[PDB]
Amino acid sequence: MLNQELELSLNMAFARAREHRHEFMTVEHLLLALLSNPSAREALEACSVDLVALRQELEAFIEQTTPVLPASEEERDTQPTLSFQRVLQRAVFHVQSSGRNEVTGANVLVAIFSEQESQAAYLLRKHEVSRLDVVNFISHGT
Amino acid sequence: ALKPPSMYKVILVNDDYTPMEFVIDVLQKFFSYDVERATQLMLAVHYQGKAICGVFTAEVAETKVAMVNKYARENEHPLLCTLEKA
């Protein structure tokens, strides 16, 4: 059960990837969209993350590594990576595991850490953020 | 202590059941090669037993591999696509 703000983030990120003709919507497109999702942004600010820098690192990586669909290709369109699908399913699983239903951008951010070979998880750890830092913020603020 | 995830080679493996035409179909449809280059890669798979179709991030490589294998399955060919650290 994705809350309204997350849903908006997911749909706009998807629309932007389609306008750029990206073949794939990645976990990096996802983290980029979360930079302005209130829930996830608050958690990153609580971890003193340089959001301007993370944003640039994500945009550069997305641009250099995401294949672009050719004009000719009008039969297939942007699709999520397996990694992206797993993060969303994992965010729902984690929330339901605690008996709740409302999924926020912050829960999605927590789930990203489990995609160990994703550039997004790498950039988050590079900015000294751990899964537990985020869970602590969600549980206890500060 | 932190290194970026690495890039991956996406490979097409040879088999005796899958038609050359389908291998070419796959190279054009999932890797955007034109007929000429797809044909060269199909011959390489035939002779070397396998060939690299592209190099991508681990995340993108995993997805392409799944897409190719589902397409082969759907068309009932045992065409096997795999990935390997670059």
Curated annotation (Swiss-Prot), chain A:
Residues 80-142 are annotated as: Repeat 2. Coiled coil: none annotated. Residues 1-142 form the Clp R domain. It comes from the Bacteria. Residues 2-65 are annotated as: Repeat 1. ATP-dependent specificity component of the ClpAP protease. It directs the protease to specific substrates. It has unfoldase activity. The primary function of the ClpA-ClpP complex appears to be the degradation of unfolded or abnormal proteins. Component of the ClpAP complex composed of six ClpA subunits assembled into a hexameric ring in the presence of ATP, and fourteen ClpP subunits arranged in two heptameric rings. Binds to ClpS. Belongs to the ClpA/ClpB family. This is ATP-dependent Clp protease ATP-binding subunit ClpA. It comes from Escherichia coli (strain K12). The gene is clpA.
UniProtKB/Swiss-Prot annotation, chain B:
GO terms for molecular function: molecular function inhibitor activity; protein-folding chaperone binding. Binds to the N-terminal domain of the chaperone ClpA. It comes from Escherichia coli (strain K12). GO terms for biological process: protein catabolic process; proteolysis; response to heat. This is ATP-dependent Clp protease adapter protein ClpS. Coiled coil: none annotated. It comes from the Bacteria. Involved in the modulation of the specificity of the ClpAP-mediated ATP-dependent protein degradation. Belongs to the ClpS family.
